[PDB]
């Protein structure tokens, strides 16, 4: 539990997930959060050294190769979380969409997830009760709806732990009806709130200073935002700034390359230079702990 | 109706040599299938890479079935699995072989290592003795459909020699292998004597980084190997993509350097086949 | 694939589980299933010479110490199905309450039992959108909405694999409403029905007729309906009779007495006689189909 | 705020002995519960047995995980879990460890058999050097926190001798285990020797069946035993009564013989705390 500071003995904390994630916030300006859709993933970014990471829904289908429709349920998203958080206690942030269910679904998703050593969870106020044939789409619940989402949530969650509101009203109902949704999530017990890139940074301190809590930015790519950088948006306010998807749109052109250099060539010379190293893997994998570790414990 | 199994044996006597692509996950096969590979891969290493685990036999039947089912549920592109040396003794690789068919996986392979069985012993690639294989191969074979391909590989060419290499080998064929695994020989001037010795088809193991030098599927099939992996290489092309987006987003505050190096949202939605749900819908819903 | 009998060959067809279910059907008068809540009890089952054997939605939520209340989703039901069938070839039939979601999470759900090897599912038009903080109740969808939730199943079903539709109209709507329902559900492409327990046998006649598919009636326990025999369902045109909790039950209650005898007597002695032995846990096991395999194959 | 291995420890330390009962699964434990125990038992025999399986050591990890984590999702009760030998050389038995503290377990128990190396091996128990159980007790101390608690198991006894045993014991002792796990002994008056010796608490086994027989925890208390354990006892009758329903109603075409050994709607509701859930809800709904 207790670190201390070069010869002498000063307090420290052992901190749960949440505590290292609300930490991270205030200790960052803003903090940057990278989406990673396994645990190697996890193991990059933090040897890159950010401070939080995140396990995007939409990641979760798409590696299943399954499209975000809200197909995976609280175990897809859970196995995903769990093998990640095994591989590294850097603070993880998962989506878990609309919550799986009703109240105790929500309940048991909050408990799971912190009990596989997760610190912050994002839900959303998207409608989850569609009849059987209905079209992909997005519609809001009621505003009293989400409160009750969130009702369930924070009845069962410990204090440290993060729940972080997520309002799509943005898209369809402009920057007013967004920032009353936004407060009402406040009030029924959201510790932060995550925002959609707003089209004009100058929206954001209005944004930032009516919900009070921390604000989370969406950074994602290949949508209707733009994108500012981490100085800008926290100078407007933003506390964390989100990578959700980043990474692997890299990855997954990368792999194609690949794919289609063995098939054209019957080869991959080509490709050989856009691989990462062994001996970069073996750092990544810290496999000299591995070694260490053994000769400390045996038969060295 | 093709079983797993039946596609692979197909795919193996219909391509010269079958290539045989590395998948991490469910959207990498589905990337594979779209470039048109025959059969893909789940490599052992991989899949304890990638839970940030070295490949020290950490990894159970549960990690890699898992993984294995994942694949299976988004294609039926015949899939070989690395079941590492079977996971313990004869009643868990019989385990093992039934779990995977169940998974719809199509074809296995199991290696010669020694399985570690001092708590505290070193990394090391021994070989376990002629025998002991054997026994492996029987436990599998004596659980396994007719048409579940079984593919035997034998480690012992780097510390035993040609000549043993090939006694193994043929030694698991009557154990009742089907196909024989291949790391990737010195010279691809040996490849003949083993191929025509062993009789059965020969893979050959085409990974980056390591010892063995990299020959065409061409070259390859001259000498007489029938199937081609290429186990990791989508994998380590994935991690450098994905670490070079990390330092850019750190470095730069934004990714907006990176966007060139990104599948369009118009490639992710082909490859998923999104269109596909929405014709589904309107197909069978609202009248 | 294929056997023989006495010394020469007759035809052997290698049957799917959806195929050796319906086989099951066909051959019993009626056929009864038993529930089974683990791997372990279906191996009792099929030692007493049960041809098929169930998978309760409620056993699985019960065993997990969960309340049937819709909180359970597809990898709870997945998981203790996949566990019964590596352990035995007998047909099974699962639970999977109202699909767990849309259209796509009942085709995944559909998939996802079929490579698991069970035989047939059964699926319920209770309402699922239901509020965040909604009370435990019985609503009926609409007769459409069910039909639609009967297309998504049929829709990726093998030919073989067996659809039990099952209407929960009759407590609240009456005979007539049921077997309206129930037909539809029918020529939405249900295989079978699944029909709760009638408090007259001699409605079972219309029920059957009207709906011509085979009809399953549901002999709980400690509910509304009375207790008939399989005979005397059988006569009136029943093709299969489930006995969903009746294990498990008598299983709980001997659990309990077993922990009062040690609690209060400091010892176990009491309940000696009410333990199955090691020597019949053995031959459940087939213990001896182990040490036989390993002998033929190897040091012997 | 009290770690699950903190509450092992209390519930060791307050109780003279402390009993643990088996649970197989979620429904078990809250039954144990509701009659007041004050730890409960994850049974690796029972883990194999309710998946259809001999205890031949075919489960792995993954198994054992499973099972605690649904049982741990459902109580605060301290659980301590049978890991057999660790699954594996000193990485498996240290994700074992970090496995079961991130599933809440509080603690494990972990023997000195043998781990079934050659591939076609006869069932037996034989047991590893002294040495070799160090190194597995090592492995896991490497890892574990300072609350979890590791019991040790010797089968050293039939084997060995009382002598041996204690031998082994306090080695295993000195290389961090927090207590010591003993088959029952052939003679009650042979624990005050042991317990006095090994010094730690020492958790004697009350399996039925078996070649031990069955003290009461008041006399093994009067010769030093901490904790009693009734590892599969539950289980015995749950499959007894199982059996008696499955057979009464292939017997009689229905199950009316069978009603009253089931347990009623309303203890189940009460065992579920049903109440609770629709409580939770008027609480927080609808104004
Ligand atoms: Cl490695
Ligand atoms: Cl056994």
Do not use: W
Not at 136 to 159: F, Q, Y
Not at 277 to 288: I, Q
């Amino acid at each position: 539990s207790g670190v201390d500071l070069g010869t002498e003995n000063l307090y420290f904390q052992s901190m749960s997930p949440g505590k290292l994630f609300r930490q991270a916030v205030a200790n960052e300006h803003p903090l940057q959060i990278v989406g990673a859709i396994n645990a190697y993933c996890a193991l990059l970014a933090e040897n890159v050294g950010f401070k939080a990471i995140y396990l995007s829904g939409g990641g979760v289908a798409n590696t299943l190769g399954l499209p975000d429709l809200g197909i995976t349920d609280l175990h897809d998203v859970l196995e995903d979380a769990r093998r990640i958080t095994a591989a590294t206690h850097l603070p993880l942030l998962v989506d878990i969409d609309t919550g799986f269910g009703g109240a105790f679904t929500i309940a048991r998703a909050i408990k799971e997830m912190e009990r596989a050593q997760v610190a912050a969870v994002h839900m959303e106020d998207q409608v989850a009760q569609k009849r059987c044939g209905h079209r992909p789409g997005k519609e809001l619940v009621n505003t009293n709806e989400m409160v009750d989402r969130i009702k369930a949530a924070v009845d069962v969650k410990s204090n440290d732990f993060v729940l972080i509101a997520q309002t799509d009203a943005y898209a369809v109902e402009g920057l007013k009806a967004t920032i009353d949704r936004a407060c009402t999530y406040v009030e029924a017990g959201a510790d932060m709130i995550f925002a959609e890139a707003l089209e004009n940074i100058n929206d954001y301190p209005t944004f930032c200073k009516a919900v009070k809590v921390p604000v989370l930015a969406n950074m994602t790519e290949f949508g209707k935002t733009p994108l500012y950088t981490a100085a800008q948006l926290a100078d407007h306010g933003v506390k964390m700034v989100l990578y959700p998807r980043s990474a692997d749109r890299a990855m997954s052109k990368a792999a194609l390359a690949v794919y289609e250099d063995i098939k054209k060539h019957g080869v991959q010379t080509a490709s050989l230079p856009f691989m990462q190293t062994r001996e970069a893997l073996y750092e990544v994998l810290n496999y000299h702990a591995y070694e260490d570790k053994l000769n400390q414990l045996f038969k060295r």
